[PDB]
Design a binder for this molecule. Sequence first.
Ligand SMILES: Nc1ncnc2c1ncn2[C@@H]1O[C@H](COP(=O)(O)OP(=O)(O)NP(=O)(O)O)[C@@H](O)[C@H]1O
Ligand SMILES: [Mg+2]
Ligand SMILES: [Mg+2]
Ligand SMILES: [Mg+2]
Ligand SMILES: [Mg+2]
Length: 398
Amino acid sequence: MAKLTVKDVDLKGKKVLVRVDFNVPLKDGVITNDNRITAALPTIKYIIEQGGRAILFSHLGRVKEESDKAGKSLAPVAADLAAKLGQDVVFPGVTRGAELEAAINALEDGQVLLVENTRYEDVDGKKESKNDPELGKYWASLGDGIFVNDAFGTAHRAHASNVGISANVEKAVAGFLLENEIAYIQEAVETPERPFVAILGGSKVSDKIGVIENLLEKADKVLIGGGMTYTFYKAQGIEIGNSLVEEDKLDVAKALLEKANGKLILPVDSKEANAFAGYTEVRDTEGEAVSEGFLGLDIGPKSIAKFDEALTGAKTVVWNGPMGVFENPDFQAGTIGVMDAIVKQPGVKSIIGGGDSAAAAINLGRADKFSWISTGGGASMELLEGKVLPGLAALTEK
Ligand SMILES: Nc1ncnc2c1ncn2[C@@H]1O[C@H](COP(=O)(O)OP(=O)(O)NP(=O)(O)O)[C@@H](O)[C@H]1O
Ligand SMILES: [Mg+2]
Ligand SMILES: [Mg+2]
Ligand SMILES: [Mg+2]
Ligand SMILES: [Mg+2]
């Protein structure tokens, strides 16, 4: 990597500040999904093994007033982590103070402490989420000049717990998970093994305009599916019946088509129905046009075939957005057809970067065939737009 990583610094005997992603779902003080804790382990375990003293920071949920702190303590997360590590995780229950400092000083090589929910500092003046200078300086002062960022999911935002600490230590470096997110979502896009085929779907053009623009420059082809299809169709004068469209984005859609120079590949048919729910007729369109009284709810079979051919021999694929209304079994074919066409390509580096897209891959038994499934959400989108994220800018150059 071009930034330093946790492997590039000497950790033995040192306090090591780590931003981890422990923002797990809770219900009544109970963790309902530990995936993010599991995903955090490799970096944590590495620091322990190297003889570092791990001081962990995370947010959980959002905290606007004092009453919001209830339910959002990391106490259950500290317990969960300790069980996964097979050792104690010290948990003073505070975000700052002399007791916290005393607890940190007492850590021996290989031990772990978890600071309370960083967004507890948001109650008085949004200090974490608005990156109060004094808070970042304070949290940095708890360490020995090393900060490891392993939370790609907030890398697109400037908070005290990422950029604040980074600004106040000598070495701010990437953890193992963030390193992989950068490798797949930034470097594999900027410097792709070609052919690079991007696939963008989902409900709407408006949340993907920046990514389409960037990937039109970086990719060899960009395949479009999902509801976003019908905004592109309407911009061309194609009838779309009752399909999901953003009339306020017709001009931008028209402009992306004009600039695409043949790189933007639309569906050539749809599976349509005469209602979104409670439909009594479902059928394939003959071609692009959707029937009056109907709406398009998946790409059609000619489109699946065309996209499969477009994917032949791809070496890099980035995918965000289902090709149809995947929640419904009648409209899963387009998405399944594209997933299978992606993962069969020899040597392909296949990368998923959307929430419903990852869920679909996992649910339908294809996820294990992809190279990387991103969980960075807004960060993933902003990085696919080609933006310089503050949490990454803040990292030390190798
Ligand atoms: N033809 C369609 N008409 C209406 N909705 C559609 C259509 N195709 C897909 N969708 C919806 O698109 C939604 C998912 O879109 P989107 O949220 O953009 O995907 P994602 O994988 O979650 N990407 P992101 O939100 O950036 O992480 C689902 O609710 C689908 O039902
Ligand atoms: Mg490096
Ligand atoms: Mg046609
Ligand atoms: Mg989504
Ligand atoms: Mg330089």
